[PDB]
Design an enzyme around this catalytic site. Structure first.
Site, PDB file in Angstrom:
ATOM      1  N   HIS A  23      54.460  15.626 -16.407  1.00 20.11           N
ATOM      2  CA  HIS A  23      55.395  16.537 -17.052  1.00 20.11           C
ATOM      3  C   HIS A  23      55.333  16.387 -18.554  1.00 20.11           C
ATOM      4  O   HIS A  23      54.659  15.506 -19.082  1.00 20.11           O
ATOM      5  CB  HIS A  23      56.834  16.357 -16.580  1.00 20.11           C
ATOM      6  CG  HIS A  23      57.348  14.976 -16.785  1.00 20.11           C
ATOM      7  ND1 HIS A  23      57.784  14.516 -18.014  1.00 20.11           N
ATOM      8  CD2 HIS A  23      57.504  13.952 -15.912  1.00 20.11           C
ATOM      9  CE1 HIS A  23      58.174  13.259 -17.889  1.00 20.11           C
ATOM     10  NE2 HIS A  23      58.016  12.896 -16.626  1.00 20.11           N
ATOM     11  N   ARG A  67      60.371  14.853 -22.558  1.00 18.93           N
ATOM     12  CA  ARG A  67      61.711  15.035 -22.005  1.00 18.93           C
ATOM     13  C   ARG A  67      62.784  14.366 -22.868  1.00 18.93           C
ATOM     14  O   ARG A  67      62.514  13.440 -23.605  1.00 18.93           O
ATOM     15  CB  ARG A  67      61.783  14.492 -20.561  1.00 18.93           C
ATOM     16  CG  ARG A  67      61.484  12.967 -20.457  1.00 18.93           C
ATOM     17  CD  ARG A  67      61.974  12.367 -19.160  1.00 18.93           C
ATOM     18  NE  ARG A  67      61.719  10.922 -19.003  1.00 18.93           N
ATOM     19  CZ  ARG A  67      62.305   9.937 -19.700  1.00 18.93           C
ATOM     20  NH1 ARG A  67      63.148  10.185 -20.698  1.00 18.93           N
ATOM     21  NH2 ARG A  67      62.028   8.671 -19.416  1.00 18.93           N
ATOM     22  N   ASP A 101      53.372  10.349  -6.182  1.00 24.37           N
ATOM     23  CA  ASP A 101      54.176   9.214  -6.720  1.00 24.37           C
ATOM     24  C   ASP A 101      54.947   8.562  -5.564  1.00 24.37           C
ATOM     25  O   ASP A 101      56.150   8.818  -5.382  1.00 24.37           O
ATOM     26  CB  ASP A 101      55.083   9.674  -7.872  1.00 24.37           C
ATOM     27  CG  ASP A 101      55.915   8.534  -8.489  1.00 24.37           C
ATOM     28  OD1 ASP A 101      55.538   7.965  -9.546  1.00 24.37           O
ATOM     29  OD2 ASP A 101      56.998   8.240  -7.940  1.00 24.37           O
ATOM     30  N   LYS A 112      53.182  -0.513 -17.923  1.00 24.65           N
ATOM     31  CA  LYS A 112      52.358   0.319 -17.038  1.00 24.65           C
ATOM     32  C   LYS A 112      51.306  -0.488 -16.286  1.00 24.65           C
ATOM     33  O   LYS A 112      51.228  -0.384 -15.048  1.00 24.65           O
ATOM     34  CB  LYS A 112      51.759   1.549 -17.758  1.00 24.65           C
ATOM     35  CG  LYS A 112      52.834   2.523 -18.356  1.00 24.65           C
ATOM     36  CD  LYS A 112      54.065   2.724 -17.437  1.00 24.65           C
ATOM     37  CE  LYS A 112      54.937   3.902 -17.882  1.00 24.65           C
ATOM     38  NZ  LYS A 112      56.020   4.219 -16.862  1.00 24.65           N
ATOM     39  N   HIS A 118      54.540  12.180 -12.185  1.00 24.63           N
ATOM     40  CA  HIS A 118      55.028  11.276 -13.239  1.00 24.63           C
ATOM     41  C   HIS A 118      53.942  10.335 -13.688  1.00 24.63           C
ATOM     42  O   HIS A 118      52.950  10.120 -12.974  1.00 24.63           O
ATOM     43  CB  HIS A 118      56.200  10.423 -12.762  1.00 24.63           C
ATOM     44  CG  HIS A 118      57.302  11.197 -12.116  1.00 24.63           C
ATOM     45  ND1 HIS A 118      58.439  11.567 -12.795  1.00 24.63           N
ATOM     46  CD2 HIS A 118      57.447  11.657 -10.846  1.00 24.63           C
ATOM     47  CE1 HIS A 118      59.233  12.242 -11.980  1.00 24.63           C
ATOM     48  NE2 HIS A 118      58.657  12.305 -10.790  1.00 24.63           N
TER      49      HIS A 118
END
Ligand SMILES: *[C@@H]1O[C@H](CO)[C@@H](O)[C@H](O)[C@H]1NC(C)=O
Ligand SMILES: *[C@@H]1O[C@H](CO)[C@@H](O)[C@H](O)[C@H]1NC(C)=O
Ligand SMILES: *[C@@H]1O[C@H](CO)[C@@H](O)[C@H](O)[C@H]1NC(C)=O
Length: 438
Positions: free
Chosen positions: A53, A56, A182, A272, A332
């Site tokens: 996406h 945000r 995900d 991550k 995501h």
């Protein structure tokens, strides 16, 4: 004009590029040692894009805290001057969870870009399109389809009056949904706390000096390390949430030094890497479902997967067609990390040091910001070339050719399809999905 469709967000790059997964998409095409161009004699016959996406607003949780923190800073401190002045009056107004106007435009731009790169296919083939189920992901999917559709109408070579591209399948995020974009069902992985440990350990090596300085400059204020990362988090959000996205870097950014930004970036790569990538024992196993769906697609054969794929969704041409030519998925950052690693793409990367910064060479091209920025994209291609009978697979990660692993790569980064598939024995065997339960 430092923010373009093609090159992404190149304004203030010495700061904005080190926000990790809070960095706006920026194209790495100039950083690609192998040319992204299609070689002569060669024709692209398959394109799948996996996309995050867009940019945000902060989640409701985090924004509470940010807002709370800045009130406390304003209640307690006695000198807001020099680079601190702005904090005196700063009036937190940011939205929450939703895509931002900027984030929206990013996915429009990704749609234009995808249309064009694969024009000679996008002109008359409607891509099959999937999306994880989250307002921001769904919306982003649709802003991408929006820009793709705008470019298609301006294209003299298009076959017009075909059906719209649309979101063909919204995949559920409910805790019991087999979701390959995900996955949420691997109980042992859902419980893991390895990332937290690394986050705390590595933040203890660099945040205290910043805390000291900030308490020194803002007399009356007392800060936890976590709070300091919040003021760093605000430099991304206060920049790319407003009008000024293209014109001014947030005032928050100037409270930290370049080198301090370097650590920040690296911290994000660690979250991550140890959260979802190779550093976590079950991380790449989160990617095996999607890797087996890609294999299906590349081989125009049924999905072989017993991990994260939904079988109702996959065993049916309507909801998983095998001979489309173009495919677009939206998800995501976290699932995208797991997917990149399950695909072997980072198998020349050495586990990142928990104690020192490693530059983009030491990590052989891995970082949050180079892989899952806001509006990130992965392109898988298959091409047919002059000199060779078999299809050759190629992969780009934010406009950087990333040489395949687990198969005989050529100098252009490609493997033959059969040998690429064969290399993905990890995903093909089910990875460590069996360990999700014992
Ligand atoms: C598979 O997908 C179907 C159809 O969308 C859904 O109703 C069902 O819950 C799914 N099963 C799982 C385990 O996700
Ligand atoms: C501000 O002061 C309050 C009350 O003394 C204290 O508990 C709080 O932690 C301080 N916070 C900051 C951010 O300076
Ligand atoms: C990538 O390396 C990992 C390291 O564990 C291994 O499990 C996997 O089989 C390798 N994948 C490829 C595609 O070579």
């Amino acid at each position: 004009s430092c923010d373009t469709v093609d090159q992404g967000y190149q304004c203030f790059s010495e700061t904005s590029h080190l926000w990790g997964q809070y960095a706006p998409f920026f194209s790495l095409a100039n950083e690609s040692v192998i040319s992204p161009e299609v070689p002569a004699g060669c024709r692209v016959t398959f394109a799948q894009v996996l996309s995050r996406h867009g940019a945000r607003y902060p989640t409701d949780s985090k924004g509470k805290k940010y807002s709370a923190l800045i009130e406390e800073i304003q209640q307690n401190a006695t000198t807001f001057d020099g680079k601190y002045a702005f904090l005196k009056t700063y009036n937190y107004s940011l939205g929450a969870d939703d895509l931002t106007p900027f984030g929206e435009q990013e996915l429009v731009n990704s749609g234009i870009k995808f249309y064009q790169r694969y024009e000679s296919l996008t002109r008359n083939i409607v891509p099959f399109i999937r999306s994880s189920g989250s307002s921001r992901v769904i919306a982003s999917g649709k802003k991408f389809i929006e820009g793709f559709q705008s470019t298609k109408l301006k294209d003299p070579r298009a076959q017009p009056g075909q059906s719209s591209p649309k979101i063909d399948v919204v995949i559920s995020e409910a805790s019991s949904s087999n979701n390959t974009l995900d996955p949420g069902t691997c109980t042992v992985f859902e419980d893991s706390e390895l990332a937290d440990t690394v986050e705390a350990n590595f933040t203890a090596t660099f945040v205290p000096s910043i805390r000291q300085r900030l308490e020194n400059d803002l007399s009356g204020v007392t800060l936890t390390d976590t709070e300091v990362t919040y003021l760093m988090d605000m430099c991304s959000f206060d920049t790319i949430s407003t009008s000024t996205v293209d014109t001014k870097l947030s005032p928050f950014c100037d409270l930290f030094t370049h080198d301090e930004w370097i650590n920040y970036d690296y911290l994000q790569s660690l979250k991550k890497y140890y959260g979802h990538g190779a550093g976590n024992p079950l991380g790449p196993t989160q990617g095996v479902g999607y890797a087996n769906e890609l294999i299906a697609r590349l081989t125009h054969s049924p999905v072989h997967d017993d991990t994260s794929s939904n079988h109702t969704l996959d065993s049916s041409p309507a909801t998983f067609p095998l001979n489309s030519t173009l495919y677009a998925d939206f998800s995501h950052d976290n699932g995208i990390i797991s997917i990149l690693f399950a695909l072997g793409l980072y198998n020349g990367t050495k586990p990142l040091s928990t104690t020192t910064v490693e530059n983009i060479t030491q990590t052989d091209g891995f970082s949050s910001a180079w892989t899952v920025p806001f509006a990130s994209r992965l392109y898988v291609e298959m091409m047919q070339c002059q000199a060779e009978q078999e299809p050759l697979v190629r992969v780009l990660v934010n406009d950087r050719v990333v040489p395949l692993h687990g198969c005989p790569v050529d100098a252009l980064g490609r493997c033959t399809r059969d040998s690429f598939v064969r290399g993905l024995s990890f995903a093909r065997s089910g990875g460590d999905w069996a360990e999700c339960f014992a």
